[PDB]
Point group: D2
Chain length 321, copies 4
């Protein structure tokens, strides 16, 4: 039985990380434990069509306190219909953490699962609510194809799982409810190079490109095993990505008629997941170029995401070619 704690230390042991960071990560895990409750105690406290958004808020407060020791933390607001995103800047100045508290702000999409996503970088500038300029700095300091040191997510569903990489493979820890400890439950996780599953919102089938409709239709004809693909679409980003993580296939939020540049956000959502998916033997893309290759120029910048088994994404990139 190896806990998250043990394992963390043993990473610092093999000098993969420093103490100052072992603290940040340890602090984060707690915050996750606390948010899990929130989500289970979901509609008991809210007795005192909206519950998910009031909860986005609280979860950032939780994040804030849990790392007060390591750093100072501020909130890039929800400028449309989104989740507000917390950011911690280490007093030490060595690290910066970007924290999506809960995948979504829809009641529907969180009706069975949700989760927090985070990635950690290594700045240059003393870049220091968060007013415009104040922000942009962040964009320029968070360089996902470069200084991105570690990343992960915690899913809150039937089981609570924390998934994580520091640069040397992905590891997964199930939370033990009895004793309130994370136990390593998945060693160096590897994404099937192939999988016959696809996650898309097909209700948007008619808002897509012909290039893409051909991809999606290609999937439905059988076999040749007489066995078509399987479609599963929870509508929860962390959920759908987790299942893909373990069982392979492809997850996709494409651009369409109404959404010119996708819907998921590069820095908060896409860049962390991809980095993780690459670390596990998969590919993370925008249809044309790997998603980390990309440098965030804009601020709440959107993108198409295609991510999963390594073969399945190539097969897509080809149809969009």
């Amino acid at each position: 039985i190896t806990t998250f704690t043990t394992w963390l230390l043993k990473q610092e042991q093999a000098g993969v990380i420093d103490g100052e960071l072992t603290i940040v990560l340890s602090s984060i895990s707690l915050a996750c434990k606390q948010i899990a409750s929130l989500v289970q105690r979901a509609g008991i406290s809210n007795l005192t069509g909206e519950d998910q958004k009031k909860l986005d808020v609280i979860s950032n407060e939780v994040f804030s306190s849990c790392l007060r020791s390591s750093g100072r933390t501020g909130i890039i607001a929800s400028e449309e219909e989104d989740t507000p995103v917390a950011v911690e800047e280490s007093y030490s100045g060595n690290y910066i953490v970007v924290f999506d508290p809960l995948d979504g702000s829809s009641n529907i999409d969180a009706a069975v699962s949700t989760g927090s996503i985070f990635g950690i970088y290594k700045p240059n500038e003393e870049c220091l609510t968060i007013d415009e300029v104040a922000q942009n700095c962040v964009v320029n300091v968070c360089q996902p194809g470069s200084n991105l040191l570690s990343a992960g997510y915690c899913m809150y569903s039937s089981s609570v799982i924390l998934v994580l990489s520091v640069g040397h493979g992905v590891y997964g820890f199930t939370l033990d409810p009895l004793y309130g400890e994370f136990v390593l439950s998945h060693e160096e996780i590897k994404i099937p190079k192939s999988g016959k599953i696809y996650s898309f919102n097909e209700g948007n089938y008619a808002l897509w490109d012909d290039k893409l409709k051909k991809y999606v239709d290609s999937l439905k004809d059988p076999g040749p095993s007489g066995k078509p693909y399987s479609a599963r679409y929870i509508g929860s980003l962390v959920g759908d990505f987790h299942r893909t993580m373990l069982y392979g296939g492809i997850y996709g939020y494409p651009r369409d008629s109404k959404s010119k540049n996708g819907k998921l956000r590069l820095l908060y959502e896409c860049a962390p997941m991809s980095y993780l998916a690459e670390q596990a033997g998969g590919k993370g893309s925008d249809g044309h170029q790997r998603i980390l290759d990309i440098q965030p120029e804009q601020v709440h910048q959107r993108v198409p995401l295609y991510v999963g088994s390594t073969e399945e994404v190539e097969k897509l990139e080809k149809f969009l070619a």
Copy 2:
């Protein structure tokens, strides 16, 4: 704050139920609490696929003990890739309970949510592993359009919820993790007469009838609001049905090439859900006739299920006409 206990008693108070039954239902809720743990402590004990299947088993053992007081209970085996189904027969002989321990036996379908389903009848004949004849009796005593007294389900996901009807509306209780008590969180729940969401495995699109493909395609052209339908398909029966419960739309397991008569089982799965959906202002169907109208002749009898908002099912029944 009204607990499940309080509320139960108050039902017996208004003589809606008898004591002997208030016990059965109370016993069942506990069993659910226990199975929720199992599912959370999912892959910690199993460090000592078939994580799901080994777990189907245990959950029936849990059911058995929890009602030992009220009755005697035996197991209709998994005659294939199914869940084995426990059945309790009251010593009093007044009641019979049919308990699907977990919606599925796939690792992948349970990767974020699962759940138990149950329905309770008032027999005529005494039925007493369960050998063939022994069973069939059951089919003949469980008459879902007649003696079906109460039914419900418990979902195990981000939140644990128990949903239930005794004949006078559907009520939902969230499980409170701190104090380990179910708290009434949804009063007489009503299913939107319409909803623009659809739950189908579209990977089987090419194994379907033209009648049905037309239905499904009808859904994807926009609006006229420019707003198509939404597709969400967890692959978990209880999950998908719960979301439909709250947010409306249609859930569907249709028959196809490979599966001549659907895939869900009439008595264990379909008859309970429908009864609940009717109790909440929706419709439960097989494409042609209401699903409760139907009398189980066969044993592990399958059927197509179409269930949800009242308008959305009519609209389907029409395309299959």
Copy 3:
């Protein structure tokens, strides 16, 4: 496995109780679960001496809400260094409940264990903070040797246990932490007619009567088994009484120099415990006459308590003769 719920119902089943009361008792158990937390979460919330007293208060609030359904409830205040005592009066008017929230108001005495005590009567008159007259009514309506229907305590220590009688023997339920349910763990509990253990504050040895010193000294000479008595004094009323409950012996709060009429209070503390100890095959006394025989004339009326194994109390009554 028989829960408190099951068992309660089965009492109403054998018509030992009515529904309206099954509710009061069921409500009470919850309140206990909640107070247990308070006590465990003891000095975590209180990071945001005197911790015990602030907690007396909260626990009555908890009691209040938990029976809001059954009745209305008010507080007789702490006239010395005591616990304030909640009282519920059923709307139906059939029942009255007296609730000591926590045995003590000392930090020291509650450093490892504490507990709530309650007794329930059937009134003849309407009593309606609680101003003087308002109270006295209560004294006159609560007649412990008469209308006292049920009573019990819940102990909060290494294990949480709820102990209870409705008139036909004493039963004990351990609280199950995993699933948050009370499980019957002691059937019709019987107090050893003898036991070689004594619970007294011997620091007050020199404030006692000679009659009593002789009792206490009688205990310390060995055997004749060469085996003296054992002294155990937690200082926690519920704790010390519980151990006595299971393992026999004598518990004692005597009168002395400074305290002319004992220190424990007849109606709140002594009358409930004794009634329980009589129900389990023991005796509850004041040194001279059984403690229930006694009719409360005064208001916050004190008394010596000697309670435990049936032989050990007789043996005392004799030395005080």
Copy 4:
């Protein structure tokens, strides 16, 4: 909010400890969480006196597994009515841990509280069930006035608390049941130099020395404040020591007629507690010389213990002079 984890790391941060040790201590805390459950789930599993002893056993198994990483561990059996004691020997060979799983083996003494005690030393040569010779080695390698690096106890009662010192003051962490985390709740704890409380089994009054009876009687005459001493004696070692820890006074297990050299064991029980009491501003004695001064020659070696406020122990040492 500082967890045990955070705080541990921050100790290794200020290089007070090494990683290899931060792991041992972290491992131990878990084992404690697990044993706490056992003790709460006390008589629910045991439905499937003698409950305490069967439990001593299990708790060592729990200890074993929880440090399997760090080292190898064996059991010095119960040579009396005692607790068997686990010992871990680090693979490193750098550290050795001695673990009393639960203070006692009596049902009575554990009826409201119990606890595990441990101390950690710094061997030279490795000892490699544990047959005699095999053991003695241990006695010679564990030198409590020398190589004893850290020590602590965990109490299992109304609250679960873990108390600990590594050499720079004593710190106390309450276990948070909701989230299953230890939270620092007592900073550098200091034992009142005086306290008017005494913990002795006075049932053995007549098996004591006159020297000692005079001490004990000295305590019972009042004041001069007119205020005598208070006696509290739970009969639980960890419990009685904990109360003393916080509220001051004296705890005592003296030698007597039947027990020539006390009853508590030097290496397992006494040497750890004292070391802790010294670290908190108190004294730990045998009546004549400080208890750590003493070098264990024998194996399951007994001793009188007098421990607590610094003045109260001196005052005793004098009467025994």
